[PDB]
Structures are given as C-alpha cells and as structure tokens.
Write a protein that binds this ligand. Structure first.
Ligand code: GTP
Ligand code: 4IP
Ligand code: MG
Length: 520
C-alpha cells in the first residue's frame, strides 16, 4: 500500500472509496464514474452506469441530468438504458412524468432537454402503445403539461387556465386529430391537485467557503520536502490561499493562511513565470499550512517556500498583486514565531521517538471570540497572549503529563464554518470552547456543537467543553452551559464541561487531565 498506518481494514477502506466516488461524481460526473470503475465499485457498460445513476444513492440529481444530456456516444447509451429502467406501463402521461422527473433535474440547455424528453416520450409510447399517434404528440403534450404546471402553480402567471382552456389548447395535437376529452381532463386535474414534486439539490457545494473569491486559476506548484511539480486549481479568498487537484473537488488539497508572508519573483530553469511565497522575517522556518493525505486526514505542511509557476507573465502579475493585497499583516504572527522558537526543543524529536510516546489528535472549535487561540498558546507557550482573529487555523503540539496533544485550532468566523468538516478526519478529542458571557450567541454555539458531534467522522470523539471567560461578571456557570448546550439529552457520548479562564489559565490543565483520563 505505502500509506501511513491508520484506520486500515476492509469496511473502512471500501466505505471510504464509496464515499470518495460519490464526492467526485457530484463535482464532475465523468470523473466520479471513472473513479468507481477503477476501484471495482462499478462496471463500465452503459447499462451498469445507468443503474448506478438510476439508484442515485447520495448523487446530486442536477449532476445526473447534466451527464445524461450530453451528446457523447456513451452518454446517449446510458440515457437510453436509464429511461428503460423506468416503468411507465399503465400510467397516464402526468403519472409517468412525475416518476421520470423524480430521477434527475432537467439541464438548462435546449438540446440536452430535447434529447432527454425525446428519450422519455419514446419510452412512454413503447410502454403505452396506441395512446398517442406519434412520439412527437407525446413530447409536445409533455411540454403542454409542464407549461400547465407553471401556469397553475407559479404566482407570476395571473390568468389560471380552466380545464376547458387546457382541453382546447391541445386541439389537433394527436397527428392532426384530438385526444380524448377525458384524458386531457384527467391530466389537467392531476396537475391542478398536485404540482410536480421536484427533488431539490442541496449539498453539492459541500462547503460554501470559496464563494466569490478574490482570484482563482490554474497554477503549477512545487512540493515541500519532495520537490515535485503538480497542477493545482488555486482559490484566493478571505486571507487564505487554497489549492485543489480538480475544479470539481469540493474539499481543498491544501490551505495556506496568508499570515505575514511576502512574494518575490524568481527564475526557474524549467518552469516559466515563477514567484515564491516566503516569510521575510524567519528565513528557513516552516510556513504554516496544511494539506490532505490520501485518507483525508489534514497534516501540517513542510514548506519553507512555495514556488509557483503561472501559465503567462500576465497571470503571474495578477496572482502576485492579488496575493499581496490579501496578506494578513500583524505583529501577532511574528510574536508567536519568535516565542515558539525560543522554547523550541530539538531533543523533543529524539525523545518523542524513543519514549515512542503515544499521543492524541485534538480538534478545537467554537464561535469566533470564544477563546480558542488564547487557550492554545497559554498551553503551548505558558503565557497569555493578545490574539487577533484566526483567518484559517493554528496548530500546535503540546506535551502535558506524558501525553502529546496535537491541537488544531480552526477559525470560528461565520465564513470559515462550512470548512470545519474538513478537519474532522482523525480527530480523537473535540474541544469546544464557549464564551460564557455571550448569552446572545449561546444558542448559536449549541447549534454548531451538535452539527459537529453528529457528523459520521466525529461519532467516536470524546467531548471537552471549555466553559470559558469565567472571570467575567454574570458569566454562565458549568451547570448552565450543560443545559444551554443541550448536553443533558446526550447520554450515549463521553462529555465534560470544564470551567475556564483562558487568560489566567484557570481550568486548562484540568481540561487536559480530563482528556487523558477519558480517552480510549
Ligand atoms: N475576559 C476574558 N477574555 C478572554 C478569555 N479568553 C479569551 N479572551 C479574549 O477573547 C478574545 C478572543 O479570544 P480568541 O482566543 O482570539 O478567540 P478565538 O476563539 O480564537 O476566535 P477566532 O480566532 O475568531 O476563532 C480575545 O481578546 C481574548 O483575549 C477569558 O477567559 N476571559
Ligand atoms: O505527489 P508527490 O510527488 O508524492 O509529492 C507530494 C506533492 O508534491 C504534494 O503536493 P499536493 O499536496 O499539491 O499533492 C506535496 O504537498 P504540499 O501540498 O504540502 O506541497 C508533498 O510535499 P511534502 O509532503 O512536503 O513532501 C509531496 O510529497
Ligand atoms: Mg483564534
């Protein structure tokens, strides 16, 4: 295999591939289908692909429609097999349309709609011979039914057709003659009683972190320790530089918080239009970043610089200008680096491998301003620092009473929260930090907490709540926090509410003691 050795077993790996295949499909249907075929989870025939789409388990129905509408020879065959899996016999045209329109969402392009509705009409007529004199009749009536659905049910259409209007509107449609009055009336009445129920695509953008970015585009980037070049889709937004393998990916490959970095033009012997991201104040020091490993676990980057090649000098200039404008500049970052380096223990590596100490991966989440970063550095540096809001994440490893805690502190601002799920994989303990003086946002904190702990990737995590800011007047006590966060209901999980004051340190060691005592 050649992987780091973590969760490895049949059910684990197979379910992961299944989930990976679906995620890929929803970003790019051709690529998801190819992944599943390569991973022996799907057979390559049009009929097999059709069955996969027809079941559509965890598949975006708009994406299904996009794929089925394509002009490709393979896609045309998939479409025909897809319509063949629908049984329209002994159903009227509205009932058949209800069924078909549950299975996918119609694409926007006229030629794609036409291909799909021709395939539907042909199938309907084969299933119900003699009802319509031609496929054309069936196709046109299908759109008369769709237009009726709009006219009756969209408030923007003022004049609602009567049954008699619908009947007469369709005169001559049956290859020059009229369809049965009672058939048209039945169709009208069905639509009038119940609009078409349409599946609604929610969740495609898994995140919504990258919406309306400062800049995006393809670049080539050089690796950290292993100096290999990779083509990556970059998105610059909210003081972070993200990169992805494919534009269809819904999770980043890498995240680079733009904290006190600079940009320089460089010459490269093989790649054109190159620049580097680097830290001018700490030459040779690792740039804070994270990247995703094969199993989805986020890990720290190893870069001292990021060398990047743009496809033209124009795009190079654009990217440099944009990145420079998006750098978060603040003494805070230099303060952290300097203090960390002072108490940086070289021996720690030779002792960590020898004690062979086991450790504990921690994800620390909570609303913005809760106290997360203050807690992190109180633990890491033994001192209370003056923080600024965290645009991406901070990550530190803290040794406490023979346990090494690898602590991921993720920014809690609104815009960042859809990205929290990115950091779940591998989490052994959740620290959820709450501002106990903030009664205005306690219900919001409750909502966020339960979304986290109900996630499939977080089911096994023990839960430490830091009921923070106990120093403040009228701050909610641990028993109130227990109630307000709805923890009392949860009797099947291991959780604890630890009162804390991050700025004095009160309660922090107690919380770490609880984690060690309860981690199994
Ligand atoms: N009074 C009081 N203030 C605190 C306490 N802990 C943290 N703070 C302050 O609350 C503010 C926000 O704390 P941070 O540690 O930056 O909060 P955060 O959770 O990291 O916020 P994000 O980076 O946006 O996710 C800072 O001014 C801290 O000094 C505390 O225990 N008592
Ligand atoms: O793909 P191969 O040739 O194995 O080499 C990888 C890629 O260059 C990675 O880039 P990407 O993450 O874009 O796939 C890079 O991670 P970075 O993203 O941190 O550059 C790794 O850096 P190191 O882990 O530092 O060696 C490097 O080992
Ligand atoms: Mg913070």
């Amino acid at each position: 295999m050649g992987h780091h050795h973590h969760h490895h077993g049949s059910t684990t790996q197979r379910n992961k591939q299944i989930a990976m295949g679906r995620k890929k499909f929803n970003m790019d249907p051709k690529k998801g289908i190819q992944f599943l075929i390569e991973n022996d989870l799907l057979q390559s025939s049009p009929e097999d692909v059709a069955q996969f789409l027809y079941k559509g388990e965890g598949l975006n129905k708009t994406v299904i429609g996009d794929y089925l509408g394509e002009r490709d020879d393979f896609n045309i065959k998939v479409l025909q097999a897809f319509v063949e899996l629908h049984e329209f016999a002994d159903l009227n045209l509205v009932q058949a349309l209800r069924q078909f329109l549950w299975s996918f969402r119609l694409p926007g392009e006229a030629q794609k709609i036409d291909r799909m509705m021709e395939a539907f009409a042909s199938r309907y007529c084969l299933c119900n011979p003699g009802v319509f004199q031609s496929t054309d009749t069936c196709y046109v009536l299908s759109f008369a039914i769709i237009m009726l659905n709009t006219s009756l049910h969209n408030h923007n259409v003022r004049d609602k057709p009567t049954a008699e209007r619908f009947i007469t509107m369709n005169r001559g449609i049956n290859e020059g003659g009229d369809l049965p009055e009672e058939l048209l009336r039945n169709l009208y009445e069905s639509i009038k009683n119940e609009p078409f129920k349409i599946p609604e695509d929610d969740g495609n953008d898994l995140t919504h972190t990258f919406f309306n970015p400062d800049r995006e585009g393809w670049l080539l980037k050089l690796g950290g320790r292993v100096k290999t070049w990779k083509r990556r889709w970059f998105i610059l937004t909210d003081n972070c530089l993200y990169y992805f393998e494919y534009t269809t990916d819904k999770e980043p490959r890498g995240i680079i918080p733009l904290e006190n970095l600079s940009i320089r033009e460089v010459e490269d012997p093989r790649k054109p239009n190159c620049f580097e991201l680097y830290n001018p104040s700490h030459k040779g020091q690792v740039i804070k970043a994270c990247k995703t490993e094969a199993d989805g676990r986020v890990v720290e980057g190893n870069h001292v610089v990021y060398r990047i090649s743009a496809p033209s000098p124009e795009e190079k200039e654009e990217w440099m200008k944009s990145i420079k404008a998006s750098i978060s500049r603040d003494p805070f970052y230099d303060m952290l680096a300097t203090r960390k380096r002072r108490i940086a223990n070289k021996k720690g590596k030779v002792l960590s491998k020898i004690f062979g100490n086991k450790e504990m991966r921690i994800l620390m989440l909570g609303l913005d301003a809760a106290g997360k970063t203050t807690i992190l550095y109180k633990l890491k540096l033994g001192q209370s620092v003056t923080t600024i809001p965290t645009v991406g994440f901070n990550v530190e490893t803290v040794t406490y009473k023979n346990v090494k805690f690898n602590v991921w502190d993720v920014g809690g601002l609104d815009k960042i929260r859809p990205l929290w799920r990115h950091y779940y994989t591998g989490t052994q303990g959740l620290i959820f930090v709450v501002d106990c003086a903030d009664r205005d946002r306690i219900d919001e904190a409750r909502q966020e907490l339960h979304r986290i702990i109900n996630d499939r990737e977080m089911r096994d995590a023990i839960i430490l709540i830091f009921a923070n800011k106990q120093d403040l007047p009228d701050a909610m006590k641990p028993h109130e926090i227990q109630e307000k966060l709805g923890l009392t209901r949860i009797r099947d999980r291991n959780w604890y509410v630890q009162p804390s004051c991050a700025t004095s340190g009160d309660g922090l060691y107690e919380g770490l003691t609880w984690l060690t005592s309860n981690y199994n």
